[PDB]
């Protein structure tokens, strides 16, 4: 397979990146087998996680060997392949599984890291210094996930010396099989964005129109712990009722500048969702509750206020399509709020982005900022799983062009259509949390000006 010829020459790093069905795995297994037939090489096949030997490439190597008719040249055991002439040897370990064993390995000439998109930073940091024999090589094959993932950073963005980087897709595969073609064509039609990621190997990256950067979010995680301040203020919760579609319902809650809960609501109708979200608000001790009223949520006001009966909890229907709040007020932090934002959705997503950016500059560049103007994610309270789902949605929120030079964002419907992603309801819920239109004191009425 001609494109791989540079892997035959000596290079410290040989990295093959591409999408599904590119032929990169078959090529590498073939080259490694042919090398083993000729040189007494010790070859480590490594991956992030190996729960059983069947997760490794040993079966692929056996098939290659059998395919080319080399069977009689080899010894084959459960977890090892050895060439009878050269004494070359394949071995197979997971990095996360037994790091200790990997560090102890000696005389390794070639390490193949397969499915390397899964390989974490700490894994590379364990693995790479163990491959220390002079002229030893590290071969890497992976299908890019995110541009910010360590593997993509390490070999594409900030690449080491002496790297042979090949980029391959199914069109570079002369024996691209029908079973994969059908699946590829089907995917190309149903979801073009997913197709380019899976089949053309394009990593997930930030649109140049995105408004919130991932590095801000990472800095913002536990920023209150990093910078040494406590949550102070009212509790605000918000609910995104989603649609009648499959998309999960959203809930977010914060205590002042510290977000404390992010939740998804699955397999609920509209009333179940409202009941779920209002119950969370009560459990979170909310002083203020908002929900998206622009769609299916427009009828939820009665159920919502009833759920709060007897409790001093403000209840506000958020309509993101409306003119911005206080639109005639001068813009801050002759130009009015109305000149700047098309609508409430943009207004409050930018309030969120601004808080996040300010926190990022505080954490990363030591620039002082009032905690009140920042936003921290309480990782422990929220849980890593929900936090990551939220972040994956926030990094996709994007600005679109506007013919009055106003700030405007792609709607949820537009995102779903163009990006092929589920509605970003966790992100919208958090956005609505940024808004506090209802004035209240323990000693007074609730006043909505
Ligand atoms: N040199 C080859 N000879 C015959 N078939 C091949 C060859 N290279 C790839 N293929 C076919 O293409 C398919 C995908 O190749 P593979 O290396 O698994 O791609 P990737 O690892 O990039 O997803 C294989 O399952 C095999 O059927």
Q: Is 26 annotated as a binding residue?
A: yes
Q: What are the backbone dihedrals phi and psi of residue 263, each rounded to the nearest 5 degrees, phi first?
A: -135, 150
**Ligand 1 pocket by Cβ (under 6 Å):** 1, 18, 20-26, 173, 175-177
Closest CA to 81 of 73, 69, 92, 90: 90
* CA gap 217, 389 in Å, rounded: 12
What is the residue-wise DSSP string for 14-31?
EEEEE-TTSSHHHHHHHH
- Resolution of the structure in the document, Å: 2.1
Closest CA to 58 of 85, 40, 82, 34: 82
* CA gap 300, 440 in Å, rounded: 22
Helix axes 425-433, 344-365, angle to 10 degrees: 90
Q: What are the backbone dihedrals phi and psi of residue 126, each rounded to the nearest 5 degrees, phi first?
A: -75, -55
Helix axes 24-36, 58-67, angle to 10 degrees: 70
Which atom belonging to ligand 1 lies closest to the Cα atom of 20? 23
Distance between Cα 408 and ligand 1 center (Å): 45
Among 3, 15, 19, 21, the mutation site with the greatest number of ligand 1 atoms within 8 A of its Cβ is 21
State how beta strands 110-113 and 137-142 pair. parallel
Q: How big is the chain by its Cα radius of gyration, in Å?
A: 27
The pair of structure tokens assigned to 282 is 């009560």
Q: Which residue has the tokens 């970003």?
A: 424
Q: What are the backbone dihedrals phi and psi of residue 331, each rounded to the nearest 5 degrees, phi first?
A: -80, 140
* CA gap 180, 198 in Å, rounded: 12
Q: What is the dihedral of CA 241, 388, 52, 125, to 10 degrees?
A: 170
State how far Cα 13 lies from the chain centre: 26
Please answer whether residues 203 and 197 qualify as being in contact, where contact means their C-beta atoms are separated by less than 8 angstroms. Answer: yes
Q: Which residue has the tokens 């408004």?
A: 211
Strand partners, 81: 76, 90
First to last CA, the chain: 71
What is the residue-wise DSSP string for 108-177?
--EEEE-SGGG--HHHHHHHGGG--STT-EEEEEE---BTTSHHHIIIIISPPSSEEEEEE-GGG-TT--
Distance between Cα 301 and ligand 1 center (Å): 57
The pair of structure tokens assigned to 420 is 């092929």
| DSSP 8-state secondary structure symbol assigned to residue 261 | E
State how beta strands 13-18 and 163-168 pair. parallel
Phi-psi label, residue 285: left if phi above 0, alpha if psi -120 to 50, beta otherwise? left
Residue with CA nearest ligand 1 atom 27? 177
Q: What are the backbone dihedrals phi and psi of residue 115, each rounded to the nearest 5 degrees, phi first?
A: 50, 45
Q: What is the dihedral of CA 118, 121, 123, 124, to 10 degrees?
A: 100
Please answer whether residues 224 and 257 qualify as being in contact, where contact means their C-beta atoms are separated by less than 8 angstroms. Answer: yes
Cβ density class 300-313: b for 16+ within 10 Å, e for less? beeebeebbeeeeb
The pair of structure tokens assigned to 42 is 């010790």
* CA gap 424, 426 in Å, rounded: 6
Reported in sequence order, the residue ranges of 266-308 that DSSP labels E, i.e. its strands, are: 288-292
Reported in sequence order, the residue ranges of 197-313 that DSSP labels E, i.e. its strands, are: 235-240, 249-255, 258-265, 288-292
Q: Which residue has the tokens 């053309």?
A: 200
Distance between Cα 166 and ligand 1 center (Å): 16
Beta-carbon contacts of 405 under 8 Å, excluding residues fewer than 6 positions away, are none
Reported in sequence order, the residue ranges of 256-339 that DSSP labels E, i.e. its strands, are: 258-265, 288-292, 314-318
Strand partners, 125: none
**CA 54 to each of CA 370, 383, 429: distance values in angstroms, whole numbers, following the listed order:** 54, 32, 42
Distance between Cα 229 and ligand 1 center (Å): 55
Q: Is 257 annotated as a binding residue?
A: no
Beta-carbon contacts of 355 under 8 Å, excluding residues fewer than 6 positions away, are 257, 373, 374, 375, 434
Q: What is the largest CA-CA distance in the chain?
A: 89
Please answer whether residues 289 and 278 qualify as being in contact, where contact means their C-beta atoms are separated by less than 8 angstroms. Answer: yes
The pair of structure tokens assigned to 110 is 């070639």
* CA gap 249, 263 in Å, rounded: 8
Q: Which residue has the tokens 């998109």?
A: 117
The pair of structure tokens assigned to 170 is 């199914």
* DSSP SS3 for 306: helix
CA-CA-CA-CA torsion sign (294, 299, 304, 307):
negative
Give the number of other Cβ atoms within 10 Å of residue 151's Cβ. Answer: 26
Domains, the chain, with CATH or none: 1-206 (3.40.50.300), 207-449 (3.30.420.240)
Closest CA to 377 of 369, 389, 366: 389
DSSP alpha helix (H) spans, 56-203: 58-67, 99-104, 121-127, 150-152, 178-190, 192-198
Q: What are the backbone dihedrals phi and psi of residue 5, each rounded to the nearest 5 degrees, phi first?
A: -45, -35
**CA 87 to each of CA 71, 94, 177, 408, 444: distance values in angstroms, whole numbers, following the listed order:** 15, 23, 34, 65, 85
Beta-carbon contacts of 95 under 8 Å, excluding residues fewer than 6 positions away, are 46, 47, 48, 49, 102, 119, 123, 126, 127
Closest CA to 354 of 213, 254, 207: 213
The pair of structure tokens assigned to 295 is 């769609």
State how beta strands 376-377 and 42-47 pair. unpaired
Closest CA to 358 of 391, 333, 385, 338: 333
Q: Is 295 annotated as a binding residue?
A: no
């Amino acid at each position: 397979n001609p494109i791989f010829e540079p892997f035959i020459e000596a290079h410290r790093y040989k990295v093959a990146k591409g999408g599904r069905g590119s032929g990169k795995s078959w090529a590498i297994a073939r080259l490694l087998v042919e090398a083993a037939r000729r040189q007494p090489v010790r070859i480590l096949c490594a991956r992030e996680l190996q729960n059983s030997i069947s997760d490794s490439v040993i079966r692929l190597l056996e098939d290659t060997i059998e395919r080319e008719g080399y069977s009689a040249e080899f010894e084959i055991q459960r977890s090892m392949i050895r060439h009878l002439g050269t004494n070359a040897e394949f071995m197979f370990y997971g990095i996360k599984n037994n790091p200790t064993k990997i560090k102890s390995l000696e005389g390794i000439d070639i390490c193949w890291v397969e499915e390397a998109e899964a390989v974490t930073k700490e894994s590379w940091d364990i693995l790479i210094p163990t491959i220390r024999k002079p002229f030893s090589e590290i071969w890497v094959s992976f299908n890019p996930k995110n541009i910010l993932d360590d593997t993509y950073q390490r070999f594409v963005v900030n690449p080491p010396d002496d790297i042979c980087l090949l980029t391959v897709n199914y069109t570079d595969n002369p024996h691209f099989p029908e079973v994969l073609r059908l699946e590829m064509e089907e995917c190309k039609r149903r979801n073009p964005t997913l197709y380019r990621h899976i089949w053309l190997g394009e990593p997930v990256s930030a649109s140049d129109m995105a408004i919130i950067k991932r590095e801000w979010l990472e800095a913002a995680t536990d920023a209150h712990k990093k910078l040494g301040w406590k949550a102070k203020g009212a509790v605000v919760s918000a609910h995104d009722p989603s649609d009648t579609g499959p998309d999960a319902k959203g809930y977010a809650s914060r205590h002042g500048s510290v977000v404390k809960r992010i939740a998804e609501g699955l397999l609920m109708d509209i009333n179940e969702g409202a009941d779920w979200a209002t119950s969370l608000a009560i459990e979170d001790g909310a002083d203020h509750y908002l929900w998206d009223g622009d769609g299916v949520g427009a009828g939820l006001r009665r159920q919502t206020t009833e759920a709060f009966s007897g409790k001093k909890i403000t209840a506000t229907m958020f309509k993101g399509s409306e003119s911005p709040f206080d639109e005639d007020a001068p813009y801050q932090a002759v130009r009015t709020i109305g000149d700047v934002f098309r609508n409430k959705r943009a207004q409050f997503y930018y309030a969120l982005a601004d808080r996040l950016y300010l926190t990022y500059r505080a954490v990363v560049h030591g620039e002082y900022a009032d905690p009140d103007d920042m936003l921290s994610f309480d990782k422990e309270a929220i849980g890593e799983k929900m936090l990551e789902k939220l972040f994956a949605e926030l990094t996709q929120i994007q600005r679109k062009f506007n013919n009055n030079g106003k700030l405007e964002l792609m709607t949820k419907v537009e995102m779903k259509q163009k990006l092929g992603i589920p509605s970003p309801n966790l992100a919208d819920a958090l956005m609505m949390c940024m808004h506090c239109p209802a004035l209240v004191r323990e000693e007074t009425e609730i006043y909505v000006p």
